[PDB]
Amino acid sequence: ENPMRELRIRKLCLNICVGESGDRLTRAAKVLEQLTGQTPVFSKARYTVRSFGIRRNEKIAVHCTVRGAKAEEILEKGLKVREYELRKNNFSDTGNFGFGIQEHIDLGIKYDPSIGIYGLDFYVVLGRPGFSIADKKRRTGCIGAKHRISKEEAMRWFQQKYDGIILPG
RNA sequence: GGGGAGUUUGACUGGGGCGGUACACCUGUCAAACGGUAACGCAGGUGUCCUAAGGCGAGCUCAGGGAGGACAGAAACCUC
Ligand SMILES: [Mg+2]
Ligand SMILES: [Mg+2]
Ligand SMILES: [Mg+2]
Ligand SMILES: [Mg+2]
Ligand SMILES: [Mg+2]
Ligand SMILES: [Mg+2]
Numbered sequence: 314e315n316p317m318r319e320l321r322i323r324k325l326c327l328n329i330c331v332g333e334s335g336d337r338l339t340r341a342a343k344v345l346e347q348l349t350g351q352t353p354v355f356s357k358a359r360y361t362v363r364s365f366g367i368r369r370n371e372k373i374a375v376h377c378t379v380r381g382a383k384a385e386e387i388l389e390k391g392l393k394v395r396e397y398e399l400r401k402n403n404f405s406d407t408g409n410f411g412f413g414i415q416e417h418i419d420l421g422i423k424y425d426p427s428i429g430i431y432g433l434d435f436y437v438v439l440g441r442p443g444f445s446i447a448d449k450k451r452r453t454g455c456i457g458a459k460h461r462i463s464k465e466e467a468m469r470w471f472q473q474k475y476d477g478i479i480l481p482g
Numbered sequence: 483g484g485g486g487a488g489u490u491u492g493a494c495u496g497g498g499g500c501g502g503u504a505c506a507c508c509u510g511u512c513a514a515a516c517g518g519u520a521a522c523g524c525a526g527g528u529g530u531c532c533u534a535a536g537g538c539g540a541g542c543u544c545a546g547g548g549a550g551g552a553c554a555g556a557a558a559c560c561u562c
Contacts (some may be wrong), residue, residue: 319523328551356559367558374559403550407562411551434551436561450541462562464549 320462320470323440327433333366339414340428344376344417348433349387353377385475389475391435394419397475399468402482408462410471411436439467 327349328339338355345353350393353375354366361369379387395412404410439462446454468479 324561326561330559332555332558360493360557362557365558376560378561379528389528405550405562407549409562411561413552415552432552434560436551480554 317442319442320466321440321442322384322388323438324378324380324386324442326376326378326436326438327387328374328376328436329431330431331431334372337429337431338372338375341431343352344422344428344431345375345377347422348417348420349379350383351376351377353381387435388435390420392475392477397477398480399471399477400480400482402469404464404467408464408467409436409438410467439470 319399326344329345331341332340334357342353342355354377355372356374356376357372358367358369361367367373391414393414394414399410399412399456403412411434413434414430414432418424418430441460441462443460447451447456472479
């Protein structure tokens with residue numbers, strides 16, 4: 314059949330967005346250290362609304378990206394607590410789906426009384442071999458039409474691989 | 483120390499004074515497809531700021547919009 318149309322997870326991005334900066338944000342950074350085995354990166358204050366206590370140039374959220382077998386393992390750990398029920402509204406038109414979970418105690422982490430209670434967003438992006446064209450510098454080119462992931466293809470791949478159930482939104 | 487002595491009381495201006503600076507320097511139109519071209523013609527500005535907001539080299543692409551993700555809501559952060 315298709316020679317090299319096998320779908321594959323390009324990366325898995327975890328993101329923890331807290332309200333205020335300080336000790337809680339530092340702890341939300343420490344939790345990702347043991348969750349992903351790598352140092353996260355801080356994102357801060359794209360704007361200034363002041364309606365809930367943020368300003369310009371203030372550390373707000375932490376995030377990171379995992380690729381490869383570790384990304385697949387983290388996605389499996391997330392779908393474990395998710396129990397493999399995804400809604401129809403979780404999938405985007407491009408083929409990327411995210412679910413989000415509750416506080417990270419259900420992932421299999423030893424609870425620490427000093428860290429606190431934080432969750433993550435757990436956004437997943439799907440890909441195919443050949444999507445690295447739009448990322449290189451020597452020559453840039455669009456993906457195309459028959460190669461880009463569709464809407465139904467993502468949920469079909471999810472049902473085929475992880476045997477999850479798709480609920481109507 | 484106007485008791486006394488000397489001298490001055492800017493210019494433009496639809497009379498003069500008051501008002502204003504068209505009195506020094508810029509942007510667009512007036513301005514009639516080279517340049518130049520007036521009115522107290524119009525619409526606006528300037529007497530500052532920067533050891534970086536100068537120089538070089540590298541990396542990246544912005545404003546906005548569309549579809550998604552726990553608290554998240556028109557606007558928080560992540561991804562396409
Ligand atoms: Mg006299
Ligand atoms: Mg006169
Ligand atoms: Mg002429
Ligand atoms: Mg001329
Ligand atoms: Mg350059
Ligand atoms: Mg581009």
